[PDB]
Amino acid sequence: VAYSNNSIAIPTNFTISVTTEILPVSMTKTSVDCTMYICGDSIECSNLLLQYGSFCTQLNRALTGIAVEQDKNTQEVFAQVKQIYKTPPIKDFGGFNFSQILPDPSKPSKRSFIEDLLFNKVTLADAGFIKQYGDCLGDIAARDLICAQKFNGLTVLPPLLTDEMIAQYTSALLAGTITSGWTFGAGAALQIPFAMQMAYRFNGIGVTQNVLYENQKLIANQFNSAIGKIQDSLSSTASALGKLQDVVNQNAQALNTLVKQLSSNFGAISSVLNDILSRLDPPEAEVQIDRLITGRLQSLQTYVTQQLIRAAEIRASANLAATKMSECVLGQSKRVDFCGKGYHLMSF
Amino acid sequence: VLTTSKKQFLPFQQFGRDISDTTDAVRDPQTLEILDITPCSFGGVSVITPGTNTSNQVAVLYQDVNCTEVPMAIHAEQLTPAWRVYSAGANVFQTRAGCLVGAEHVNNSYECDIPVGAGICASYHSMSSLRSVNQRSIIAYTMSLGAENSVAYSNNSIAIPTNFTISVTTEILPVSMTKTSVDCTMYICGDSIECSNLLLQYGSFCTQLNRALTGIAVEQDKNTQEVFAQVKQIYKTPPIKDFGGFNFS
Amino acid sequence: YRFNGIGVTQNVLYENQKLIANQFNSAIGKIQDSLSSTASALGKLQDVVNQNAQALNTLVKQLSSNFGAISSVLNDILSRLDPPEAEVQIDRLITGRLQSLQTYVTQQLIRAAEIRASANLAATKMSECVLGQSKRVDFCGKGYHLMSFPQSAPHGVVFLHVTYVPAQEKNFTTAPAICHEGKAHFPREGVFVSNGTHWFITQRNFYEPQIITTDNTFVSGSCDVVIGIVNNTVYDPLQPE
Ligand SMILES: *[C@@H]1O[C@H](CO)[C@@H](O[C@@H]2O[C@H](CO)[C@@H](O)[C@H](O)[C@H]2NC(C)=O)[C@H](O)[C@H]1NC(C)=O
Ligand SMILES: *[C@@H]1O[C@H](CO)[C@@H](O[C@@H]2O[C@H](CO)[C@@H](O)[C@H](O)[C@H]2NC(C)=O)[C@H](O)[C@H]1NC(C)=O
Ligand SMILES: *[C@@H]1O[C@H](CO)[C@@H](O[C@@H]2O[C@H](CO)[C@@H](O)[C@H](O)[C@H]2NC(C)=O)[C@H](O)[C@H]1NC(C)=O
Ligand SMILES: *[C@@H]1O[C@H](CO)[C@@H](O[C@@H]2O[C@H](CO)[C@@H](O)[C@H](O)[C@H]2NC(C)=O)[C@H](O)[C@H]1NC(C)=O
Ligand SMILES: *[C@@H]1O[C@H](CO)[C@@H](O[C@@H]2O[C@H](CO)[C@@H](O)[C@H](O)[C@H]2NC(C)=O)[C@H](O)[C@H]1NC(C)=O
Ligand SMILES: *[C@@H]1O[C@H](CO)[C@@H](O[C@@H]2O[C@H](CO)[C@@H](O)[C@H](O)[C@H]2NC(C)=O)[C@H](O)[C@H]1NC(C)=O
Ligand SMILES: *[C@@H]1O[C@H](CO)[C@@H](O[C@@H]2O[C@H](CO)[C@@H](O)[C@H](O)[C@H]2NC(C)=O)[C@H](O)[C@H]1NC(C)=O
Ligand SMILES: *[C@@H]1O[C@H](CO)[C@@H](O)[C@H](O)[C@H]1NC(C)=O
Ligand SMILES: *[C@@H]1O[C@H](CO)[C@@H](O)[C@H](O)[C@H]1NC(C)=O
Ligand SMILES: *[C@@H]1O[C@H](CO)[C@@H](O)[C@H](O)[C@H]1NC(C)=O
Ligand SMILES: *[C@@H]1O[C@H](CO)[C@@H](O)[C@H](O)[C@H]1NC(C)=O
Ligand SMILES: *[C@@H]1O[C@H](CO)[C@@H](O)[C@H](O)[C@H]1NC(C)=O
């Protein structure tokens, strides 16, 4: 950089840039049947587990705490405003186009075109799909992992907030920000013309209001082009939402590894409870069964401990997402690089 | 459960084992027909109940079972009569979370009281037939996100407040947790002279547990110090003086 | 100064000082009544004490379990078995009891990290809201933060957040700029509003209509560039003198 005591550089133009920040809010909620995983529905087994029942209760208590936290994390990020602002019939917004981000009425789930692209990019089909006992029983030939974990007592609990409800919360925040700007976040929403609200945002970053009014047509066109570029980038790049895909992959991998742990024998003659029961009388059988029970309990304990550490990381990201929603979506933030590189104007 | 198996074993092969190593498929000894082996239980039961003091009424939710398949899944025919009532029809409601029985579905939407899941919530409510005798029953309803509202937006219209409200709100944040220390020998040996001779090798593990606990204890004191010791200067409260009429006593 | 920070003029506080003091006193009284009449107020602090007590209680319960040993009582094994046979049974109890202690320590470490994050937020809240006025939205309570008061609580800190919330509002016609004589005029700190036949400049937060004047507004460019410009006269204080 050319530095001089009497030299300064002043911009004679400006660029409007839209950037995407992705933060994980929640992780899959899972519950484990201790007897089904260790005993495998064996009548002889679970008589030994009666003393170990207290340990199983502790594992269930930790898992239930993670599940309630995930619902709370989603609620904090999307339920900041209880008032659901109905999207108005589109009115002149100064030439700014928000139809792509606004929910589409003529489609299922009432979700935005950008939201539809994001849903397509992340594959949750691999992580789980509804399985009836009949569906698993009929499809014996295909070894789907979801049926195998369900048979071993590992199951996934559906989130309390449905995707449609999350979309309705997102639409309400979007409607409030365009129509009333920062006013809806604190106190009752007060309607303001979008161009006048945009001038206030320019005043916040230290640019005079007149510059926005004279260049309003150019500013609206630059914003529309940036939104179009973002949708094209999401559609043409498969690897966009990497963090969200990683969260689903880690949870599915952890359940799959637990099913694999059953194959291991912890010093027992066989890893199959049935084989030990068939070949050994009960006093000799108990010693071998106890070795399998202790190892299987340890595998469940290791899985629960990993889930608790993952939940803490997800909780920190969810807290940041809630802070980002209040600071950038409900207000203009003067923090540097908190709401994107450059001087923040607004966030959707 | 035994079912016919599409998979065919090679002549040397007599039985099949899955990834878990359980015998997924077996061949009948008398007849060479492969039979798949399936666990009888599928799992998935939750009991939604108001406090037992308030009522003994309960609602049962099956996560993976449709209302038609509910009796077969739980083997209701061989179950106790009280269990059969929970598998009985007329209270069955089908949800994405699963079939829910013992709860009366209501169109009205309320703030969630107990979370069934998939946008469905259950509450104990005063639903009375004929509205002449008060009756209490569990109800299943879609949760209410909030009151629907529409902002009136115009290119030349603005709303400006002509008054204001001063509001005081309380935010509670945990600063510290109880500090605890564990005597490894006392907990495991229970003051036994014979015990602890074996623990001499395991002493290193006990030292590791004590080191982690001591670190938590010092952190809790540090957490309290950071929040309350921001200013070392202790400002003496002045005899109360006029504060503009603001009361802080 | 706090009112000036949220964008409300100092004069509004001075004229309404008696009302502002009464509203603050009423809010403090409402808070004390709510705490006294509602048992379930400090849920998070109670949960922290309950979790710690539950963890110690479960550890005492774990002693009852026997990890493949003939008895969970060390004394019974010692009484019925000679030392070589007794050692195998004692070792099974020792390994299981050590595992129970290890599980408890691991849970405590995860809980300590959650408490540490909350304590760090509390320290940030104390510096940003108690020692200063924070412009962050919803960091120091809903509404425009004015000041915060810390109150000591067991295992926690309770923050009383005093905030300014806009009350009743009215509808007013608005224009981005005023065309006085072929020159666009933009309001320096206010929004142009019309009661219906007259145009005034007022602060957005509170309604204080004022006659448009050369000091009140700045003139930039020409009327044609502004899309919503409307015709009005800008008064000049210098011209009568
Ligand atoms: C600031 O940059 C903008 C955008 O690059 C310029 O607007 C362009 O003007 C040229 C004509 O010179 C047109 O061909 C382009 O279509 C305009 N861009 C868009 C996207 O509308 C603008 O001219 C620049 N301003 C200055 C002071 O040079
Ligand atoms: C906002 O942008 C969208 C997408 O560019 C515009 O939607 C187009 O609408 C026309 C009809 O007016 C259709 O023929 C196009 O297929 C739509 N998409 C595209 C890619 O052009 C929408 O009209 C824009 N909103 C306004 C009012 O400008
Ligand atoms: C702004 O709000 C305050 C508080 O509500 C109003 O002051 C009160 O008005 C009511 C209505 O008559 C009186 O009964 C109270 O005695 C007043 N004082 C208080 C502290 O409640 C005030 O009048 C309102 N101002 C406007 C512009 O309407
Ligand atoms: C500030 O408020 C307190 C109450 O919290 C006032 O103290 C007295 O409180 C009792 C009830 O607890 C009332 O019966 C008294 O009337 C209150 N004071 C008096 C002398 O009337 C305290 O006086 C208030 N401070 C001021 C100076 O207004
Ligand atoms: C300011 O104007 C808006 C729009 O006219 C008002 O909002 C409407 O108020 C009427 C009154 O009955 C309702 O029927 C409408 O449903 C409201 N919204 C719409 C979309 O028209 C608003 O109430 C006015 N402000 C005040 C102070 O009344
Ligand atoms: C809008 O505000 C103006 C203030 O300019 C009001 O005009 C006043 O009207 C009253 C009587 O109607 C006169 O006594 C004042 O001298 C006027 N003030 C002036 C000329 O500055 C006007 O009444 C208000 N209302 C409407 C509907 O226009
Ligand atoms: C606001 O005032 C301007 C300036 O007086 C008006 O502009 C005139 O518009 C008429 C047609 O309505 C033209 O014939 C003149 O050439 C314009 N200039 C002048 C100097 O008179 C304008 O009509 C007024 N109204 C609006 C809505 O802008
Ligand atoms: C055994 O006898 C049964 C009944 O007669 C017959 O169905 C089966 O094929 C026989 N299997 C062998 C081993 O021959
Ligand atoms: C049940 O709870 C209520 C308070 O909600 C209490 O008054 C009542 O005593 C409780 N019942 C019993 C049997 O203690
Ligand atoms: C089972 O219930 C679900 C709703 O939870 C429904 O979509 C499905 O069609 C029903 N039928 C099946 C597949 O058993
Ligand atoms: C509930 O809604 C359905 C569908 O609109 C309707 O058929 C039914 O009569 C309504 N009433 C109740 C409480 O079932
Ligand atoms: C405001 O909206 C009306 C109705 O659509 C329109 O006639 C008028 O030209 C618009 N004015 C501006 C400032 O865009």
Residue numbers in the entry:
A (entry chain A): 699 to 1046
B (entry chain C): 549 to 797
C (entry chain C): 898 to 1138
Article excerpt on this structure:
The homotrimeric spike (S) glycoprotein of coronaviruses forms a trimer, which plays a critical role in host cell attachment and entry by recognizing cellular receptors and mediating membrane fusion. Consequently, the spike protein, particularly its receptor-binding domain (RBD), is the principal player in determining the host range of coronaviruses. Here we determined the cryo-EM structures of the spikes from bat (RaTG13) and pangolin (PCoV_GX) coronaviruses, which are closely related to SARS-CoV-2. All three receptor-binding domains (RBDs) of these two spike trimers are in the “down” conformation, indicating they are more prone to adopt the receptor-binding inactive state.
Pangolin coronaviruses (PCoV) closely related to SARS-CoV-2 have also been identified in smuggled Malayan pangolins (Manis javanica) in China’s Guangxi (GX) and Guangdong (GD) provinces. Similarly, PCoV_GX (GenBank: QIA48614.1) shares 92.3% and 86.7% amino acid sequence identity with the SARS-CoV-2 in the spike and RBD, respectively. The overall density maps were solved to 2.48 Å for the PCoV_GX spike and 2.93 Å for the RaTG13 spike (gold-standard Fourier shell correlation = 0.143). In the PCoV_GX spike, the number of RBD-contacting residues is 27 from the counter-clockwise monomer and 16 from the clockwise monomer. The LA could be well modeled into the density and liquid chromatography coupled mass spectrometry (LC-MS) confirmed the presence of LA in the purified PCoV_GX spike. Structural comparison showed a nearly identical binding mode of the LA by the PCoV_GX and SARS-CoV-2 spikes. An arginine (PCoV_GX R406 and SARS-CoV-2 R408) and a glutamine (PCoV_GX Q407 and SARS-CoV-2 Q409) provide the anchor for interacting the headgroup carboxyl of the LA. The PCoV_GX and SARS-CoV-2 RBDs bound to hACE2 with comparable affinities of 2.7 nM and 3.9 nM, respectively. Interestingly, we found that despite exhibiting the receptor-binding inactive conformation in the cryo-EM images, the PCoV_GX spike bound hACE2 with an affinity of 130 nM, comparable to the 105 nM affinity of the SARS-CoV-2 spike. The 2D classification did not show particles with bound hACE2 for the RaTG13 spike, but ~9% of the PCoV_GX particles were bound to hACE2.
